[PDB]
Scaffold this active site. Sequence first.
Site, PDB file in Angstrom:
ATOM      1  N   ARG A 174       0.860  -1.180   0.000  1.00 50.89           N
ATOM      2  CA  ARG A 174       0.000   0.000   0.000  1.00 50.89           C
ATOM      3  C   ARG A 174       0.895   1.228   0.000  1.00 50.89           C
ATOM      4  NH1 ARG A 174      -3.860  -0.186   4.790  1.00 50.89           N
ATOM      5  NH2 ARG A 174      -5.217  -1.295   3.312  1.00 50.89           N
ATOM      6  N   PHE A 194       1.122  10.556   1.869  1.00 53.97           N
ATOM      7  CA  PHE A 194       0.887  10.010   3.207  1.00 53.97           C
ATOM      8  C   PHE A 194       1.943   9.008   3.665  1.00 53.97           C
ATOM      9  CE2 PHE A 194      -3.142  11.573   1.648  1.00 53.97           C
ATOM     10  CZ  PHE A 194      -3.574  12.352   2.696  1.00 53.97           C
ATOM     11  N   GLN A 239       3.302   1.470   3.135  1.00 55.82           N
ATOM     12  CA  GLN A 239       3.047   0.429   4.122  1.00 55.82           C
ATOM     13  C   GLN A 239       3.455  -0.942   3.590  1.00 55.82           C
ATOM     14  OE1 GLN A 239      -0.936   0.547   5.657  1.00 55.82           O
ATOM     15  NE2 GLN A 239      -0.849  -1.537   6.490  1.00 55.82           N
ATOM     16  N   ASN A 274      -1.712  -1.543  12.325  1.00 57.80           N
ATOM     17  CA  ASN A 274      -2.435  -2.417  13.242  1.00 57.80           C
ATOM     18  C   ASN A 274      -3.904  -2.464  12.853  1.00 57.80           C
ATOM     19  OD1 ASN A 274      -4.035  -0.356  14.730  1.00 57.80           O
ATOM     20  ND2 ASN A 274      -2.039   0.290  15.553  1.00 57.80           N
ATOM     21  N   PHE A 287       4.582   1.178   8.599  1.00 54.43           N
ATOM     22  CA  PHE A 287       4.497   2.198   7.565  1.00 54.43           C
ATOM     23  C   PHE A 287       5.590   3.237   7.745  1.00 54.43           C
ATOM     24  CE2 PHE A 287       2.145   5.635   9.824  1.00 54.43           C
ATOM     25  CZ  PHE A 287       1.725   4.925  10.939  1.00 54.43           C
ATOM     26  N   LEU A 331      -2.578  10.151  13.434  1.00 57.02           N
ATOM     27  CA  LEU A 331      -2.244   8.784  13.815  1.00 57.02           C
ATOM     28  C   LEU A 331      -1.609   8.686  15.196  1.00 57.02           C
ATOM     29  CD1 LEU A 331      -0.947   7.497  10.367  1.00 57.02           C
ATOM     30  CD2 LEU A 331      -3.274   7.357  11.329  1.00 57.02           C
ATOM     31  N   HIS A 336      -1.041   4.473  16.576  1.00 54.34           N
ATOM     32  CA  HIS A 336       0.035   3.662  16.023  1.00 54.34           C
ATOM     33  C   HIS A 336       1.317   3.968  16.773  1.00 54.34           C
ATOM     34  CE1 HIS A 336      -2.413   2.467  12.560  1.00 54.34           C
ATOM     35  NE2 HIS A 336      -2.973   3.651  12.748  1.00 54.34           N
TER      36      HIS A 336
END
Lengths: 170, 164
Positions: free
Chosen positions: B54, B59, B62, B101, B112, B121, B125
């Site tokens: 991903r 951003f 991942q 997660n 990531f 986040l 995370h």
Amino acid sequence: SMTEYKLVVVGAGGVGKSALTIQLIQNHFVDEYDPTIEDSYRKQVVIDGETCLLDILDTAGKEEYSAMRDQYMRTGEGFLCVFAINNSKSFADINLYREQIKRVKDSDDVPMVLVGNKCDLPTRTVDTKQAHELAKSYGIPFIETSAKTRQGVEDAFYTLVREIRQYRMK
Amino acid sequence: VNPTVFFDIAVDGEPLGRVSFELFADKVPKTAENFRALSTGEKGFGYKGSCFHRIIPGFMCQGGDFTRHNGTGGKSIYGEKFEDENFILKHTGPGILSMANAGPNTNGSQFFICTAKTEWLDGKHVVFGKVKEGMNIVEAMERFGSRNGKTSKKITIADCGQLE
Ligand SMILES: CCn1c(-c2cc(N3CCN(C)CC3)cnc2[C@H](C)OC)c2c3cc(ccc31)-c1csc(n1)C[C@H](NC(=O)[C@H]1C[C@@H]1C)C(=O)N1CCC[C@H](N1)C(=O)OCC(C)(C)C2
Ligand SMILES: Nc1nc2c(ncn2[C@@H]2O[C@H](COP(=O)(O)OP(=O)(O)NP(=O)(O)O)[C@@H](O)[C@H]2O)c(=O)[nH]1
Ligand SMILES: [Mg+2]
């Protein structure tokens, strides 16, 4: 040249938005959990004898990103608002989705269908009588589904198409 | 002292470049140790050969699913999952390395790398490292991503290990 319908599937995380969409598109039940970012699918179908092209947007159930829903609500023509029968919070969340759609689209009668998913489960927490009453207060259909067994899946999507068709004939 | 690990990134099998990371064992020792060991492969499994499934430009990138290679898998050196160690460190900008997660206390191996500040986040995370060398490689990886994260070429960790 066939008539097109932009459908958007919304609702709380884990209620089965992707499982319903994948049943319609790919004819299988996703057992694993793969939370969605955003996915789009196209499929031609025949509903009440008229061919049409469905564009289906499968959205994330992430309340922290509620502000990101406005843009796809403006574009969408009809909304499947999905809760799970074993998730009371997801049923409470329906009101918020309905009000956001109404606000963002500045419209009192956006085509919508209320979907109660996971009806295969051996227990539940949501009283579906309340779902019938909520759908009546909105003037929209309520459809029970199981993505696991495919029960009601076609009915939910095709009913939303019928709601859009009626809107366009107003 | 804080370990440094590296990934050698490949694009459809062709080398792209090396990214190295400092792991903040001085603040999140259990989380840093998991990533360190998975990078060396010393437990008999780890990141070597796995892909970045991903990549969302603007951003993060991942990766870390070396068990299912479909974005749903991965495992830690402690077992299937482990707890959120703490939230001392924050998602402050590009280069931050943090755990993916499925909700509280579900850390496995997916991680990531931020390409921007992702402060929302924080507290969800566990941040545990930061890119040292090769941020330009992480930036280059964005061209293979898309709005929903699907990649247009296979982006892999062709090799990985520990430097310090
Ligand atoms: C609304 C659209 N959307 C968006 C989003 C958000 C914005 N904002 C603009 C304004 N600012 C202030 C707020 C954010 C703008 N544009 C988009 C995207 C580009 O529009 C399509 C995100 C997102 C994340 C999920 C679902 C929908 C989502 C999601 C779905 S599972 C998830 N998160 C968490 C994810 N667990 C997993 O993978 C589990 C399965 C494994 C084990 C996870 O640990 N990590 C690591 C951290 C990053 C996260 N993945 C991820 O990929 O974040 C994507 C990101 C773009 C950062 C956020
Ligand atoms: N028993 C049962 N499980 C279902 C049903 N629909 C979905 N599930 C299961 O519920 C989990 C979540 O389903 P999923 O379709 O990913 O939910 P979602 O609404 O798309 N989640 P998200 O918002 O994160 O994308 C999966 O384990 C899936 O197999 C259903 O009708 N019955
Ligand atoms: Mg989904």
